[PDB]
């Protein structure tokens, strides 16, 4: 039989596949406000589902009324898919381990195979009154809010951040994004991040970087950031800190798993832990944290169990993600400082968003086109694509690297029209 | 004037494309524009920009006038960024007028204060096509009956809007109009919904109308049109309709008969359009053919590929060619669009090849649901001997963006498999194409 601690992305899909073989399933999930996983009950769901009602400038509450239908529908939905096959159990409870062989549940369970899909917890950073203070939420407790804040304040710079940062704004709030380094979004360009601050910017958001936080105090209905005699009065803080793995009280030690500093379960390329038939699957790898590379963790680990595995985390290449502010930053490959700190001479192209006619159709003619061409090969090295349904045109930059094939076809290529993805004519063709 | 190394007939995709391209690399260009108000070509003006712009509005329920204001905003930019990257480059001469072949070297522009004379070393036909009105007493003096580019210039919201078409333009503008608010009632001859599709999809296309208000009759032999009352009517077999305003969406065909072609040696059909090779060459010597003039597919992309095809003779390394083109894709800007490429089921069943068709309703692909819009389905079929896959049905929302992708792995040779295990992003609806093989046995 198998054990999976965890409805997740990989932990679902993994229960679903091995009841259709013939194996017993037992999938153990604590919270009945979260059939169908993190991103289902209170991430990209929920997250997204707003974040499409905002660039309509609906009203807030009317919004926050249809996300809870849209995700009370896929919590009874993804229950429904995993109960409705006779092999697995599911055991509303939190599991603790007892050894490799033996679980714990708050009834204590025996697993010839477990699958470790817990996934990630927020993390909160060490500042005094971070919890004492009302009007203090996590991204979850945020999108539960009653009423539109007037004024929203923001701990973090991140992408989670900058999404809920034009996400309140397009609603009607004030945001102030207090973000800690030097740089506004680091890991980015910074022509590109250049163009998603002139965009927040422009909606009201005001990047503060190297900002100390001190204290959070609450006085006045409002909640003040204390900053060396420098106080933002806010009426609801969003923290924005980035999630670990959750681990702590899985108690793996007694298992024989080895955890890192972070947390994470050490993993191998094909998802093997230390313990002997023990698996890990998902943000608790302590990888990227995202929905689809936790299904390839599904898939990694199928390869394994069901056909002959050669399906290792060593297939990965270029892996695409996505912002969703608005316009969406959607990037896959490397960046021009990664680009041009490598020997190979490279040439990066630009198409503004001023020259692509469906934008213009969808009334948003925001941020630009960037990619990354090796003078070497013809090839494809890096691609940031900031305008609208950038999510969905970025997913043939990374086909075709994945490939190898040469830019040029997406030069040639016959696409429809009008679309966004058609821009990528426009955009290859700059290149000599 | 002079002799013009290249004279292009129209601001078509094609010509407008070769323009820029020929004057960039040292070439005297001429293009014959007729009208002011078609500057930059079919699309930008009366075709695909203003009929999308409207249907982005007509999905948020926004008012039918301010929706006409902003697309008389985006027409008159474009038209104007258009007519301006071609004036301002010194080898082009944007020349006014309604061209007319004299003979196989000169042309004669028609501009009412008197005509000109221009020639040309080669000569590149881009005039587009043009409405196709059916023999119907009373269709021409009516007032209240508009073709495609009229009804896309009304001043108020009709309560009732007619459609003579079953075609794809029409159902285009049902649901525009239908999201506006008003109720349509689209009238086609065949005994079919959408002859050419599947059943699957037109059934769904016809009720996902039906729920809007649109009326969807068949087997329609109109006989004659009428204005009485405010209303124009409409009399059939045995019944007769009446409605606020009527659309004439019967198709369009290559304009060839005022550009008088005979004089110059260049063939054409009982349609009107130009034949052509596949590397688009008339039938008289340095003349080309490009765009919806050649009698082909009618899209902007298909244009496009055509200035490929002139541009790689012109310009050096051989010869592309029409005979290149494989899984050619399409869409339907409904409400949600319907895209597609490769064959039907209906095809492929009469094939006699190992298939599999695999379906996936929209209802199960969570980013629909974050846009409010769960409505379509998703088919494609799969050729069991190869691996490969033949043909692909998204009736979606941002189904015009994923069917590149299906059709770049169709292109390339490579079996389902990679859709199917592909790490897309998330939210998507792309992403549901790993929803959609893993479907497959
Ligand atoms: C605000 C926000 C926005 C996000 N946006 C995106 C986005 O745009 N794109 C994207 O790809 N990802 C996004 N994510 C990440 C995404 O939500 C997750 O990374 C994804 O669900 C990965 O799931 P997983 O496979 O790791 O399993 P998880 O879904 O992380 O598994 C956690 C589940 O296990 C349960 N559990 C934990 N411990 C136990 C235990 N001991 N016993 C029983 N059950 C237990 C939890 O209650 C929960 O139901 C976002 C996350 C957040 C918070
Ligand atoms: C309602 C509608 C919706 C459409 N939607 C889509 C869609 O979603 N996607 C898509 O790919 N395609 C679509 N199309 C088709 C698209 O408009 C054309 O296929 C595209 O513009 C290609 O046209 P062309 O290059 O052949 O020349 P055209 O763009 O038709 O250019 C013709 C030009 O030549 C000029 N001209 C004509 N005769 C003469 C003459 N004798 N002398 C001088 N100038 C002359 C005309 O004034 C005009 O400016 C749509 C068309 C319509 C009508
Ligand atoms: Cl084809
Ligand atoms: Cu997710
Ligand atoms: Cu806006
Ligand atoms: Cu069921
Ligand atoms: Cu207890
Ligand atoms: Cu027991
Ligand atoms: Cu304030
Ligand atoms: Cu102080
Ligand atoms: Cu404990
Ligand atoms: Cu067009
Ligand atoms: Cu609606
Ligand atoms: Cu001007
Ligand atoms: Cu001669
Ligand atoms: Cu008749
Ligand atoms: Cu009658
Ligand atoms: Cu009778
Ligand atoms: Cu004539």
Redesign the interface.
Same mark, same amino acid.
């Given at each position: 039989q198998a054990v999976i601690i965890g409805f997740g992305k990989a932990g679902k899909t993994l229960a679903v596949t091995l009841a259709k073989a013939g194996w017993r399933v037992a999938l153990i999930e604590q919270s009945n406000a979260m059939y169908g996983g993190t !991103?289902?009950n209170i991430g !990209?769901?929920p997250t997204? #589902?707003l974040v499409?009602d905002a660039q309509?400038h609906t009203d807030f509450v009317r919004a926050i009324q249809?996300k809870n239908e849209?995700v009370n529908?896929?919590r009874n939905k993804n229950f429904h898919n995993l109960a409705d096959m006779p092999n697995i159990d599911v055991i509303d409870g939190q599991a603790e381990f007892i050894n490799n062989h033996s679980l714990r549940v708050h009834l204590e369970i025996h697993g010839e195979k477990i699958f470790i899909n817990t996934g990630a917890q927020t993390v909160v950073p060490p500042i005094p009154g971070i919890t004492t203070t009302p009007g203090v939420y996590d991204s979850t407790g945020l999108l539960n809010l009653k009423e539109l804040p007037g004024h929203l304040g923001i701990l973090g710079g991140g992408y989670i951040g900058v999404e809920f940062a034009s996400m309140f704004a397009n609603f009607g709030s004030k945001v102030t994004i207090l973000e800690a380094a030097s740089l506004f979004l680091p890991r980015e360009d910074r022509d590109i991040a250049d163009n998603i601050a002139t965009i927040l910017r422009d909606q009201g958001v005001d990047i503060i970087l190297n900002a100390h936080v001190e204290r959070i105090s609450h006085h006045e209905n409002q909640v003040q950031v204390h900053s060396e005699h420098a106080q933002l009065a806010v009426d609801a803080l969003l923290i924005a800190s980035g999630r670990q793995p959750a681990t702590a009280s899985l108690h793996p030690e007694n298992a024989g798993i080895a955890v890192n500093e972070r947390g994470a379960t050490v993993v191998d390329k094909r998802l093997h832990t230390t313990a002997d038939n023990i698996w890990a699957m998902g943000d608790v790898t302590g990888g990227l944290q995202? #929905? &689809?590379?936790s299904?390839?963790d599904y898939?990694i680990v199928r390869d394994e169990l069901l056909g002959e595995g050669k399906r290792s985390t060593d297939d990965?290449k270029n892996? @695409? &993600?996505?912002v969703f502010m608005t316009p969406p930053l959607?990037r896959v490959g490397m960046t021009e400082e990664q680009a041009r700190e490598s020997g190979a001479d490279i040439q990066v192209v630009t198409l503004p968003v001023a020259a692509i @006619?469906?934008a213009?159709? $969808?009334?948003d003619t925001r941020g630009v086109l960037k990619a990354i061409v090796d003078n070497k090969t013809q090839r494809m090295l890096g691609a940031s694509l900031l305008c609208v349904?950038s999510? %969905? $045109?970025?997913?043939?930059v990374? $086909?075709?690297m994945?490939?190898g094939?040469p830019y040029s076809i997406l030069r040639?290529?016959?696409?429809?029209? @009008?679309? $966004?993805? %058609?821009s990528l004519?426009d955009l290859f063709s700059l290149v000599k």
């Open positions: !991103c289902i !990209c769901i997204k #589902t499409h309509q249809r849209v529908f896929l995202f #929905t &689809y590379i299904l390839d898939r990965r892996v @695409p &993600y996505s959607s @006619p469906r213009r159709v $969808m009334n349904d999510h %969905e $045109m970025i997913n043939i990374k $086909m075709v994945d490939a094939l040639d290529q016959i696409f429809t029209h @009008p679309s $966004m993805s %058609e004519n």
